[PDB]
Design a protein around this ligand. Structure first.
Ligand code: SAH
Ligand code: NA
Ligand code: NA
Length: 274
């Protein structure tokens, strides 16, 4: 299982920057932010989407909880952790978990470029093993799971949430983005529905704060077709590996989004007080 994930994300980050943007954010974007000046890049749409999730989780309210420890589960190429270090300058502990050694090497380089290595800790760790993270005595105020659970089988997703719940502070937020199938059954010719997806979280003990389609189907399609155009512009001789797979997937996934067969969801849950 884990070797397949490692193979998927082992490619040169410089090639990925040409495909998905300089920030290497890989869970779509929003094209509706009044602060965005068109044309809207993948970097811009991705960050504005993440900012909208933090807004929906209550972090623009002046009396939100003090963000003292952060976890990013499946932290990709590390820009969400960089953004969060800038967003919460008083947060002196941000932890990233990832199975991809190539992505973690890039994360360490990005964080070192910004002098963030004393605030951001990196762990080569499966999501199911978050119970192994150091200092259980300091719970997490904010946990990010951005485009990761779609890579998990149902047993792994349930096991990971069971491991995560004790590590979240009461009143702390888990801010999730994932790619779901809108209906349980489609014509014959890691599938999760919204009801199933939310029930894993509430069964684990979390309380729903907000769940909605975000980005919109047409915004996810825009992100995919802009990434496809980037790959075709920057690899005119032909793409290889995961970037060729993304180029092909962009059209098929965009069609499914236009037909409303699949959507991307923002899912925010909190740990309740005992
Ligand atoms: N079981 C697992 N445990 C930890 N990380 C996992 C995982 N399965 C997938 N991943 C990681 O999940 C990420 C999916 S891509 C999304 C990356 C990042 N969160 C972003 O929003 O840009 C990759 O970093 C991949 O290596
Ligand atoms: Na390159
Ligand atoms: Na690896």
């Amino acid at each position: 299982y884990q070797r397949k994930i490692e193979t998927t994300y082992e490619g040169d980050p410089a090639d990925w920057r040409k495909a998905i943007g300089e920030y290497l954010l890989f869970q779509f974007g929003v094209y509706d932010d009044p602060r965005s000046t068109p044309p809207i890049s993948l970097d811009e749409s991705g960050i504005r989407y993440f900012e909208r999730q933090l807004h929906l989780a209550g972090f623009d309210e002046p009396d939100h909880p003090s963000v003292e420890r952060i976890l990013d589960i499946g932290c990709g190429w590390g820009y969400i952790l960089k953004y969060l270090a800038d967003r919460f300058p008083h947060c002196m502990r941000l932890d990233g978990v990832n199975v991809s050694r190539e992505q973690l090497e890039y994360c360490a380089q990005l964080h070192a470029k910004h002098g963030l290595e004393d605030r951001i800790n990196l762990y080569q760790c499966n999501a199911q093993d978050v119970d192994l993270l150091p200092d259980a005595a300091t719970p997490y105020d904010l946990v990010i799971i951005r485009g990761v659970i779609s890579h998990f089988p149902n047993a792994l997703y349930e096991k990971a949430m069971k491991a995560l719940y004790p590590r979240v502070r009461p009143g702390g937020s888990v801010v999730i983005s994932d790619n779901l199938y809108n209906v349980a059954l489609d014509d014959y010719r890691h599938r999760k529905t919204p009801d199933y997806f939310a029930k894993v979280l509430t069964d684990a003990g979390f309380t729903l704060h907000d769940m909605r389609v975000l980005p919109s189907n047409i915004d996810v399609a825009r992100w995919l077709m802009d990434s496809k155009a980037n790959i075709e512009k920057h690899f005119p001789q032909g793409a290889t590996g995961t970037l060729e797979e993304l180029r092909v997937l962009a059209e098929n996934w965009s069609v499914a989004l236009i037909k409303n067969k699949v959507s991307t969801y923002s899912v925010i849950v909190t740990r309740p007080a005992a």
